[PDB]
Amino acid sequence: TFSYTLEDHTKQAFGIMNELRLSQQLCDVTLQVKYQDAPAAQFMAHKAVLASSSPVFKAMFTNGLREQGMEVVSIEGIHPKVMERLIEFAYTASISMGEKCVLHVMNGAVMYQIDSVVRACADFLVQQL
Amino acid sequence: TFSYTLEDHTKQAFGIMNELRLSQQLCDVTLQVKYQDAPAAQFMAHKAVLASSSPVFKAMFTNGLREQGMEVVSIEGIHPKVMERLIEFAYTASISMGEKCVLHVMNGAVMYQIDSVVRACADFLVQQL
What we know:
Two copies of one chain form a homodimer.
Chain A: E1 2-5, H1 9-22, E2 29-33, E3 41-45, H2 47-53, H3 55-61, E4 71-75, H4 80-92, E5 94-97, H5 102-111, H6 115-127
Parallel strand pairs in A: 2-4
Antiparallel strand pairs in A: 2-3
PDB class: signaling protein
Keywords: BTB domain, signaling protein
Assembly: dimeric
């Protein structure tokens, strides 16, 4: 038989998936993030990508109904910049923040069960000791 | 600043995306493949994943309308087993076929501009010489 594997494929395909998000193409969920007194922000994304990086989004989005088009989801208790950085991680495999943001990002990462980011933010805080 | 990258992330997230396809969860496109006298087959998938692996699916799916839910797409001129193997490549980064399928798969890969698979099927046929 003939078998082939492209190792770079998942990297490349996520790169295009990130482009479609930035271009707001094929998106099926809009996250409206309102936190205390910070201004409300909005993030469009693909439920499949969010589901692939966060067990909490997967269950949030996998329900028996066939949702028709564009679902709005109200998100409480996480800052816009934290949500943004988590979304970016889901689409890029990387995340970046200043040394004083690390704590709020772990909170958000714990809240959405992004085990890779939790473990990393935990490593950082412990090393500052 | 603090920066983190998970190299395995895109692999892992595609693994979950493949699970959601096999479970027919969060799918927004059904490909109905009818070819000559072969029996008709159906494949559910996520437009975002197809778009990320095939320029032809991306343009096929990126149009000005906000499609509502589940689009059916009729696919002609490619065999069910070829379409299946291309879909599998989009979701897994790998593709497998017997030495006599390699020609029909390149046809399909050329038709959907999956440049990685075209280049590989071309390499194989030339080496059989």
